[model samples]
Target: MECADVPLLTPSSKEMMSQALKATFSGFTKEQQRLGIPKDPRQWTETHVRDWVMWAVNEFSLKGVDFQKFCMSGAALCALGKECFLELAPDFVGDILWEHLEILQKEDVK
Candidate 1:
């Protein structure tokens, strides 16, 4: 069964999505540093992951994705591959989240 889907928008709407993704990327850092969330994904509990999902939903007005599907520990979230993310959300949502997670994972490695 399909979850609720966002209606199709004009072609130019992708520009808006790109801007939202940029904001999401920046906000991820803000959530950690300023918001007092653990900076390391491996240190994130389920609550932290939920906070992140909620933040993304609000930031992007994401309707096609469910925060319930992402109620896992941050390490589990970090282990998810792109295909797994696609399975959980639409391409627009999943791709952006996956890219953000990849950036966080890399930052943790440094």
Candidate 2:
């Protein structure tokens, strides 16, 4: 029995690939602005969290990452520690994503 369900997508055509790659390299600010992700992590709903997770995976080139595992409100997400991140993702990807989360948390203070 499988313990996990992963969502996957494939973009066909060179134009689509180009657009996808461009979006991936657009950086956090631009992407977040486009995605309408709230500045405050605590304000995020599950949809916002999933959107941010998608952006993070693409930005960091984290392969085989699943957003489903992170289906929770930002408040719940913020409660998680590095160990929890590691439990949800691979060490390399988890560390990177956690660092980004820390940055968002810091932004919340300002």
Candidate 3:
């Protein structure tokens, strides 16, 4: 299923977005799957993931990945925080995550 379609980030935010993506994807992998282990982020259904991502971006004050880049950067920022910070990447994780969300409204849409 397709969402409203968020935009991709500018060159400067690309790196941060990439890190976030890794975190989100890795986090999903670590989640419990059907009482066992998890796989894709879609285990909960497309709309569920979309709503969750929206919450993380808006209500939770997660990341500012562009609306056009929603499918790309938003997911990245989430992954970066959930996986990268929780597992490895420290010191800079918070900073990156902060910026990713701080500029959400200002980010260009993909």
Per-residue lDDT of model 2, residues 1-110, tens digit only: 44484333454433332344334433664567677877655668988766666666666567577777777688866777778876777765565566566666655555
| lDDT (Cα atoms) of all candidates against the true structure | 0.68, 0.63, 0.38
Could you give candidate 1's per-residue lDDT for residues 81-100 as a string of tens digits? Answer: 78887577777677666666
| Number of the candidate with higher TM-score, 1 or 2 | 1
Which model is ahead, 1 or 2, in terms of lDDT? 1
What is the TM-score of candidate 3? 0.28
Write the candidate numbers in order of decreasing lDDT: 1, 2, 3
Candidate 1 vs. true structure, TM-score: 0.70
Q: List the candidates ranked by TM-score, beginning with the highest.
A: 1, 2, 3
Scored against the true structure, residue 41 in model 3 reaches a CA lDDT of 35
**Model 1, which residues run further than 4 Å from truth?**
1-17
* lDDT score for candidate 2 against the true structure: 0.63
lDDT for model 3, on a 0 to 1 scale?
0.38
TM-score of 2: 0.64
